[PDB]
Symmetry: C2
Subunit: 636 residues, 2 copies
């Protein structure tokens, strides 16, 4: 058992030399071997790793933890997600920390330590995640990442250079004798022993500009003349709305002069241009894409939105995969004979404008990426990104394959529109993402959440912030909303409590400016802060473990625990909305008993029926008076 | 001739393919082969390089341009600096630009281009520098740089890993067939042909933490136990002033408990600890410092200020060189027998607390670094940093060696205090740095400059901003002061007009927060600017060539040109100060003629004698009325 091999190894290596820095919150209650100097703590990483793996191993029995927990439990349906509490993380950021204990952060330092996040450290933190009450960890893409066309000094987990491999950067030099796929397998074993499920993320429709799949399948990508790289942009048509075009508009779009110039920028794959040259380079050392640019003067195009007239820039670190061998059926009568394969709004949304020839070989590869992870590591679920673009048959196949191996596997749809619950369920998903974080952070909008949740036909991730949005700690009335918003949101019907990495310690700086974000959030930190202006998605970033918001940490822990003490009401109690202009409120009744969730978002205080009351602490009084921005859980 | 070999090469390579982006200001008037799309311009770098080197080569005669211009001119004294106009630059930043022409900047891109600055590009820009009127280029350290203990993704030119080598990063991949020392030699040839002198920068007293000199001379550095790295800081003594301690204070300092704990952190060199181990590792592949840390558990200490109680942090990317074999004489009677070599305030200022045994072998090496550049490339002068710390005999030697080879060589002292002119001249320097930029940017202080300049016994670099200070474009009343400050400063007595790279196009963002800088300057750019918050000294940064302040560019060019039209008055005319509370003003008279420099820094307008008047344009009127923040050059 790998987790045990790593334990053995740490004991051999122990020396008692404390020079590896970690934040005080990473040190569990049972660990005592550490020095405390200047605010931070120092340890022998081998002693820390040995005592923590001991703590985890001693809770195991005699089963195989390298398979889904659904197996050890005998589950045949995905009902488990409805009783779970999710902790969302980007390993690279969550586990980063300057282990030198002085000066500036470094990807790798002179003491031999990897300061960036690793699977080994993600394991040392399991006792912390567990203390938050979470029983499932969701991770952003951890597959191999491209280092071309970056925005900052770190790649985006979303430009997948190889869907079948993990990024070697997640390997920790402290465990020299081990490989990355082992460290990860050992990580998943540790989570299972502790009762913690693992959910990964994948994006089928795209790939890095220099995807590893290019050497053996150059014809799975599109190509354009290098001299056309600089001005490659999605052809606009101002007189048309800002949306994904319908059938009628295609006839107009294809008759535009700029669209016609666009279509003319594409070429045939390097293999079909010069068979001998292809075979020469294909077998050379060096980046596949640099070689092709230099030898064929062609390159893969950057991606872009499938809505015409979208003002967002082009996605330079990714390209699209060629889903069909032929061009879209509904658009063939507009093309010139001999038109090479090209990218346009319709080609991108294959779910709406498909050709008549599925690239069967690619489709099978795609449908075997998740199963590869289920069988190899025993993961319990996954989130599928950009599903809107996949043809119904390719999606039906992707799901049949994971469900065939484990009927308890949970598929999460990257669906932000809560009204698309019905269509997501019809496609075969078990959970939708939703957008509760937008209403949760606005006193004037939070009251809409109760009715929105009740109508759902699938459960959703009840969040107050995610990796793409601003932190709850920076919304209006933060000092109050950072506690009020999660209390109201985590108790909603059909909910799956979501805790974003860093939220539990009150982090302010956003990880990315994606959804509903203001460029000025880029400067919430002090200009003397080492990480001022940095965004975790494209730059090296360490969360503020040394100066945490203890008030938020302590409240999140207690809130999750009380919410779980009443899970039965949330799941099977009859819901009744009681929300007013100035009072968000609702109730659950089950077997003669009743609980009430209440929050005052008005300008004047309000009073309500009492009983046993919770608001961070338990009290007992007949009448409860809620001043503005105060909340309570009443038990009658 | 290398410059000619590079020319030949560019012509062979030319192809007419325009895909390499450069800013419109980099394209000279004679060059016509370029496409202009979206604001920027595209060219075949080989055609641009061929036509520009042709333009430079055609102005040459038959002499050897790989030696100082003083030779071709027959000069025996450093009088030339007094008639010069200096352009200051950090090559890495000055010549950086995203040659892809879209997306984000990358140290090296997929088209094969190095976007960071190179000697090749510093050559293509010579026609631009020349159009500013500059005839000498000053460069910050370009020696090999350490990549350990960095603040951002780019190293500081000041942590010298090898004083005798140039950093391989200045090589341009476009010139594959050539080596870095050639490209540089060719760069210096080009400057000489054009009449442009070259001045380099060196720091004798320090070295990178992992200096290349460690393998053959481990005993030229100091060492401390790895376990003492985290808390290594300069021992404070609050009851004492914030200054470099004198003799009496040493007796007190050495009796302090924290100082004694400090002295105990040091060890003997790795060669003297385990002779066999040293010889083993010394011959291994990999970073010398990582190897020593791992094998001897010791490391070089970070540097720090020589003034006790200084609040600035420690200098982690540099360490000090062991100048004496023994400990400081005046402090031996306070040490315990067997005290290893250690770093403290007195050891750092060797000029004041010397031992009795000079490390002769190091001293000779140090005294041969500049000559190595004079003889190998033909440089014309140099700035010596941290000269305050060098023993009088080691400095006397460093100067005798450059002056012996070229008696016309100009030595520049890194002396910010204009009252230390007399002592700098006595030490053997020809120019002092000064601090005119501080007064130049404050309407209430600028009037002091006239008297300050007149008393000098050496010329100074007349600047309104430098790499370590805020940009003139961000001081109070910027829109007016960015033109008024240089006009008043460049005409001062004993002046050497200085133009900081980026100043000529009105750059705002500082390069570093060193001298007199406010952390909030870190955010003068828009939060949507690719380089928001970045500092060129430790991060990749591209100056704003695409959105330049044309008003400042045009005025700087005309100002330098008019100042040079009257150089004779500045240099040999009798000076007379006429400054008042609200009017900075002075005159030069020579052979019955007179010129007057005037600027109104008051609240009410003022009038003065007219004649022929300059203020950006020439006019003629008997009386000149100066409103607040207006200036003029009057010729009677």
């Amino acid at each position: 058992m790998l987790l045990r091999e790593i334990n053995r190894y740490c004991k051999e290596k122990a020396t008692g030399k404390r020079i590896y820095a970690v934040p005080k919150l990473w040190i569990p209650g049972f660990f005592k071997k550490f020095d405390e100097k200047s605010g931070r703590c120092f340890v022998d990483p081998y002693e820390l790793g040995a005592e923590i793996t001991d703590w985890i191993l001693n809770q195991s029995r005699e089963w195989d933890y390298s398979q889904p927990l659904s197996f050890l439990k005998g589950e045949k349906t995905p009902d488990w997600i409805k009783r779970s509490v999710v902790y969302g993380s980007l390993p690279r950021t969550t586990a980063a920390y300057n282990h030198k204990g002085s000066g500036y952060y470094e990807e790798n330092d002179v003491l031999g330590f990897r300061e960036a996040g690793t699977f080994f450290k993600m394991m040392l933190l399991l006792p912390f995640v567990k203390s938050l009450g979470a029983d499932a960890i969701y991770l952003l893409p951890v597959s191999r990442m491209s280092d071309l066309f970056k925005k900052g000094d770190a790649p985006s987990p979303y430009s997948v250079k190889n869907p079948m491999e993990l990024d070697e950067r997640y390997h920790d030099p402290l465990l020299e004798p081990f490989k990355v796929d082992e460290e990860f397998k050992a990580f998943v074993e540790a989570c299972h022993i502790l009762g913690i499920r693992v959910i990964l993320d994948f994006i089928p429709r795209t790939a890095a500009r220099d995807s590893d799949l290019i050497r053996e399948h150059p014809d799975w990508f599109y190509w354009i003349k290098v001299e056309e790289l600089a001005d490659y942009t999605p052809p606009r048509a101002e007189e048309l709305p800002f949306k994904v075009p319908d059938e009628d508009e295609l006839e107009i779009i294809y008759n535009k002069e700029n669209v016609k110039r666009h279509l003319k920028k594409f070429t045939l794959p390097p293999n079909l241009i010069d068979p001998q040259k292809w075979e020469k380079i294909k077998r050379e050392e060096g980046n596949i894409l640099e070689l092709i640019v230099k030898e064929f003067g062609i390159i893969t195009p950057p991606g872009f939105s499938d809505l015409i007239n979208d003002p967002q820039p082009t996605w330079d670190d990714v390209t699209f995969l060629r889903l069909y061998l032929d061009h879209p059926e509904a658009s063939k009568r507009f093309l010139d004979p001999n038109q090479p394969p090209y990218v346009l709004y319709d080609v991108i949304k294959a779910s709406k404008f498909p050709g008549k020839e599925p690239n069967r070989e690619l489709w099978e590869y795609l449908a075997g990426v998740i199963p590869h992870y289920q069988k190899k590591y025993g993961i319990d679920g996954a989130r599928l990104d950009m599903g809107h673009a996949l043809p119904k048959e390719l999606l039906d196949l992707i799901i049949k394959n994971v469900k065939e191996y484990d009927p308890a596997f949970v598929m999460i749809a990257e669906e932000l529109d809560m009204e698309k619950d019905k269509a997501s369920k019809e496609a075969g998903y078990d959970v939708i993402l939703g957008s509760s974080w937008y209403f949760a952070g606005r006193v004037e909008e939070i009251g809409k959440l109760p009715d929105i949740a009740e109508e759902l036909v699938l459960p959703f991730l009840a969040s107050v912030e995610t990796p793409d949005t601003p932190r709850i700690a920076t919304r209006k009335y933060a000092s109050k909303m950072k506690k009020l918003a999660p209390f109201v949101t985590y108790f909603l019907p059909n909910s799956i409590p979501y805790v974003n990495t860093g939220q539990e310690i009150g982090e302010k700086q956003p990880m990315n400016l994606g959804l509903d974000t203001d460029p000025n959030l880029r400067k919430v930190l002090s200009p003397t802060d080492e990480f001022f202006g940095k965004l975790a998605f494209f730059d090296h970033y360490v969360l503020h473990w040394d100066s945490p918001d203890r008030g938020v940490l302590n409240f999140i822990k207690k809130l999750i625990k009380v919410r779980h003490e009443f899970l039965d009401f949330v799941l099977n109690g009859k819901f009744e909305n009681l929300t007013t202009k100035d009072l968000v409120m609702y109730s659950y009744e089950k077997n003669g008993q009743k609980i009430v969730i209440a929050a005052n978002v008005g300008k004047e205080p309000k009073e309500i029926t009492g009983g046993r009351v919770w608001n961070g602490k338990w009290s007992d009084e007949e009448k409860v008076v809620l001043k503005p921005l105060e909340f309570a859980l009443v038990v009658q």
